[PDB]
């Protein structure tokens, strides 16, 4: 659906309202990524940069498939967050409450959304048609299936992927969608695809990798933040070698692995130049990564 200056302004107002709700001192938000208090103003700023780059050619901007999807989603997510406060009431202020957890997941979604927007409009101009996917075999798949498209409906992505990497069941497809659809808008962007295919490389065995590392691995934590990982490993502080892992939110495309050390500290690191399987095997051997989510059985990869 076409976007004009007006729908942007309406989105900006909804964003400001979320920011006012999230400023309540009772929430006590920590200034640490993802931090909704900086994410929303930052998304507004980048939207201003985009608008600026399209002055006198708003017609072009308004018709861009990706931009229309993005704005529709921004409106949906901001309304969702407002509805969340309205329905949760005081429950938003109990850390550990389900509605507060819902807000944290939203905060991560806004983080992924801003990273996506910046990836597709670097410097404020659309460059989705030339987005560079990092793994060569994944870039080939995307080109073969979708040409230079920036975004595709989930149904169309699933069908295309299945032809090269078989999906075994509907519930597997829904778990896959949950993993790759970072912006939670039922479309898959070339940026989301690049993220997933970096995280679950190598391409030759993509869905076997994801099934092993995420679908059935007790250590994988979907839509979890740095602070949540520190809180979750706290219950295992006297159990060195307890560990979990998740997408890094500031270095999208990379894994953050948290673990309990011998001296009872919780560290988090992002492996350098090594796919997850190898990071897990190496850390298993060294005794860092032994008990996924503090459990006694660790998958043998």
């Amino acid at each position: 659906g076409t976007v004009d200056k007006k729908m942007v302004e309406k989105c900006w107002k909804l964003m400001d309202k979320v920011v006012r709700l999230c400023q309540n001192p009772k929430l006590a938000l920590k200034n640490s990524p993802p931090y909704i208090l900086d994410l929303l103003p930052d998304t507004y700023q980048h939207l201003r940069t985009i608008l600026s780059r399209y002055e006198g050619k708003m017609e072009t901007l308004g018709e861009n498939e990706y931009f229309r999807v993005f704005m529709e989603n921004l409106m949906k997510k901001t309304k969702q967050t407002i509805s969340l406060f309205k329905e949760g009431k005081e429950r938003m202020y109990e850390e550990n409450s389900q509605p507060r957890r819902n807000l944290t997941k939203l905060s991560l979604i806004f983080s992924h959304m801003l990273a996506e927007l910046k990836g597709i409009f670097p410097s404020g101009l659309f460059q989705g048609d030339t987005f560079r996917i990092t793994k060569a075999d994944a870039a080939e798949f995307w080109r073969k299936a979708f040409g230079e498209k920036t975004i595709v409906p989930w149904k169309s992505f699933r069908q295309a992927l299945h032809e090269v990497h078989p999906i075994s069941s509907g519930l597997e497809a829904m778990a896959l969608k949950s993993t790759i659809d970072l912006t939670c808008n039922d479309y898959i962007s070339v940026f989301e695809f690049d993220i997933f295919t970096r995280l679950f490389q190598p391409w030759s065995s993509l869905l076997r990798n994801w099934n092993s590392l995420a679908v059935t691995h007790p250590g994988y934590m979907a839509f979890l933040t740095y602070d949540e990982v520190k809180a979750r490993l706290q219950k295992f502080i006297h159990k060195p070698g307890s560990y979990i892992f998740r997408l890094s939110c500031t270095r999208l495309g990379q894994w953050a692995i948290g673990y309990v050390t011998a001296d009872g500290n919780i560290l988090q690191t992002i492996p350098h130049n090594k796919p997850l399987f190898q990071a897990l095997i190496d850390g298993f051997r060294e005794g860092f990564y032994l008990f996924p989510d503090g459990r006694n059985q660790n998958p043998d990869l």
């Binding site: 953050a256 560290l267 988090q268 690191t269 992002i270």
Partner: peptide
């Protein structure tokens, strides 16, 4: 934040 992230260490080695």
């Amino acid at each position: 934040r992230y260490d080695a």
